[model samples]
Target: GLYRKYIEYPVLQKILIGLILGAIVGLILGHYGYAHAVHTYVKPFGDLFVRLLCMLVMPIVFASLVVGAASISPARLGRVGVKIVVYYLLTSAFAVTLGIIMARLFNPGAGIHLAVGGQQFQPHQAPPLVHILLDIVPTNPFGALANGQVLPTIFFAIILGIAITYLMNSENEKVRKSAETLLDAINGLAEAMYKIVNGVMQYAPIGVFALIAYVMAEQGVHVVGELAKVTAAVYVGLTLQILLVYFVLLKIYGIDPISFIKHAKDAMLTAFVTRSSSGTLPVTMRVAKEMGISEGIYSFTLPLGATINMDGTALYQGVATFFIANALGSHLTVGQQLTIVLTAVLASIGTAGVPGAGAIMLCMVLHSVGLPLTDPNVAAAYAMILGIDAILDMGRTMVNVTGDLTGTAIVAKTEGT
Candidate 1:
């Protein structure tokens, strides 16, 4: 041997290694009795990692929203809100549209038979739109945080942050002093959480290894044929959403998509492995900063995107409607398909950044289209999706994070970054 090792791979490279190793190990253990033994031992490490990441979420969202808002003028803060909302809504709509087209082209559920749980799937009514609107304002912020209700938490933080931003710009010296003191305290806490994020990620490789290993061992690689097609369809749509849709959007905004991808690879990889966008926020912010995005924009937009922007969720829902319809032998008309588009886009706006939430949201959208959630056949098909949710979640979560970062870049670029 003539070659000697000089340098090691970075953390991201190590994480990629962990991913491959976990999947391979899980696949090996899956067919054996020891699969349960390894899963029992290994799965807890991943759970703890998830909890640690979650522990920082409320604090990071609160402090970052306040400080990110405070960093901008009040007028610009308002403008930023408008810009961000429009971007989120439009991109989400486009994502669902792309999904619809792809699902129709592939027709994933043709000739598939479902054998779901024997128990009936009881239909739970979705709250009225008025209720969702009213509930956005947190009745108690601490309670919202404790329960991990992110949308309400975001609402409270945005209003508080806007108030603080206005106070800092006020003519009253006493008010301005009070604002400075508050901002100093909040920003310091935010920085501390960011530090903990970096520290916690050192264990990420182990955590990721545990997660993938347990999931594969528990769920097995083989899925129903129809379900596999649905999975393939989703990933295809997700790939297009990121590569074709995002690339064009970025180029239209005069940014080099390749450079953006180069900078964002770590965050995207983390999102895929973890299957939690909020859990991946720490790395997402790090990547955004590394890409030379201003702290003011990313701190505001990325967190906002995490809560409300669910492009991946929308796309998944769109494709899923077609899959379920086919499996149920229910032919959908143009009107029915439009209901799916509308419901999917709206459903995505309220989606939480947690695993399996996409499927839950899919249930709601299906209900909106007069497809009863209690359909045993539909329930049976969904059981299949749950088996492979983690795998598909990785791809969709990657798309979700990319959309977040792309939106951030466009906002920053427009602001003269």
Candidate 2:
């Protein structure tokens, strides 16, 4: 009881303290040549934090989905699926719009010029659009879980949940009892994972302190002005997307944006430093539960959002396209701008939820508008951009994680759960 009270201090306070201290520590270490020591000793705390989150991620994801889906009808799940897809697309489009507006007004890339062959930059192409759809069906559920293929894992889990409900509704007594036992077992597993999460999070402050310190020490504040403009514009766009777009829409669903943010801040900060939405799922779920959102809605919605919903990625794609165009001295017409929005929505669907995946997703956006991919000058631009992606990703990933939690709240409110 005593330990519980000590560990029960507000998660937001702990995270905020870690975030500020980490930055200060990083600055000091970098200035005093202690960066390497921090990396060797301090950074492990952060890495262990991520690993702990990852440890529970698989069980939390699988058990929660099954328990959540079993609580609702298949028809309701279908409706939720539609709602999730529509909301993701609409928000992403809005995010892209905001990016375009910011980029056009700020002209972040106006003064940048790239010389051919400045560095090596080879962008990876996303698979064909048809392939994304096909890959959603996991050929082997166990394989999907082992490989951390979340989309397919979700697909399988939903099906299992639905089948469990079907069994409970069956005429056979044995079948009904079996279904109840399985549901109870899974629900228990979820509770155990939550307990572990609580324990792991006691060390979250140390993890965050190390993470932020490493990032600051690794990437100092010396980016070129033009590159800095791109970063600034993206950050501004993300802020607007959250305040102007996400908050406004969420309010209509009767969800309190401020309350949601207050609870979800730990997950947001974790996403920022770790730069992985999937990696941050445990914290996200913990926050949703804290906010009183129904697991029936959040379990399915949050994991799905982490996989397909990429508002931050879409917005970054928009700003990056504009930056590259300006750098190449190329014109962006209304037609191309519209194309940018459409392609960004599509690209967000296929992008992975890990760090640096944004760079690969940006390739598809560039291809859609014919900005530049293979040319040496474009390579130069990418080289400069890649160097700064680690920093930019922190901001965008925070937005992405925020959007996921917001979606959970909205869906829970709508479902009346």
Candidate 3:
């Protein structure tokens, strides 16, 4: 303590404690529908924090991926790419199914549980599946890069990186070295910027304070009344995702998920509190390493997961779709349910590369089932359900990150690496 005498430890510690206390205060303010309290104080703090994080997401992703492209070999990248995408596909599908099952079991959509009023959301028409897949290849690479549209940008980068990887011996050594150095420079810049962003986050208490207070001031607490069933539906999905789908997958793969989760708790806790799978990458990597999953698998999968493996979030979208549909007095047919499963999975990936992604995926779900996001009714219904979505998301991101680790571990086991 003497050595670090200049440290503002007590100030920082008090600020942290105050932020936590404010969150409790804010939630109660929101729970009671104190719009003036939320808007005037609570929401502003969280909103600023979110904005700061958003500011970093795009640059960080591009730089990280580009740097990865430069660092890794072509053959290895290809191999890892296939493995990662396969893992994403299987787990994402499993997550959606778990959501559907839980929603069905809980029947939270019966419309009896929500207050049915808030900002309205009109459904946006989704591009046809064929169109979406066809559009994967970017027409203008710069457009993808500039817009920070993830999937298309990733596609373009992968192709370019692959080409660089296979550059024949005919290529000049000077040119090859130049390209590598250039990429390495970009990577270095990205890391520096991320550190700067990290430094800024030290003010999170202030931002979180403003955000929570504002949300309470604007919406008030009554916004969440009678919405327990809708909240329950999502919680149900969260629970089954961890206990059922993930647990079963681990059992089938003969891995001790309990032990893994236990050791992974540090990373998972970080994910829960931060609610950003992407931001929690380094921690997830640490946990995966602790679980004995090799770097080869984790380095690739964890980053990829940050970009697209939104199983927990996607699962929520699917179940929430069902719940909202039920509350609106609409019954989902088997076909519609299957449609939710497919669309939610696909939408999660499609939007994964996009900023502010989850809610956009919700747009996809609403479109899939013909719910009118534009209608005041659905918006009101969503407002009611979102009562605890933030908290639910905290749990969801933790499991989601853990799911990626489990997959990489299983895959490594099978490949005998």
What alpha-carbon RMSD in Å does predicted model 2 have with respect to the real structure? 11.2
Kindly list the per-residue Cα lDDT of model 2 for residues 1-417, writing each as its tens digit.
986875677544565566668768888888888777877787667667655544654565667667655654454458777777778778888989999999998876666544332332333344555665687688999988886555565567768888888888788998899998998998888667667666665566676677667655654533357777898898999988888887788777767667677777767777787767788888898898898867778888887788778887788888887887787677776767876786567556533423334654565466446544546445435444544565667788799899878877787778774
281 Cα displacement, candidate 3 (Å): 1.0
For residues 319-405, could you state the per-residue lDDT of candidate 1 as single tens digits? 887887776566776666666776566455544523334644665566555665444456435434434455666787788888988
Reference-based lDDT, each prediction: 0.69, 0.69, 0.61
Which runs in model 3 stand beyond 4 Å of their true positions? 1-77, 112-226, 353-355
What TM-score quantifies how close candidate 1 is to the native fold? 0.58
lDDT of 3 by residue, 194-249 (tens): 56554444554565456434433344333333356656767767776777776787
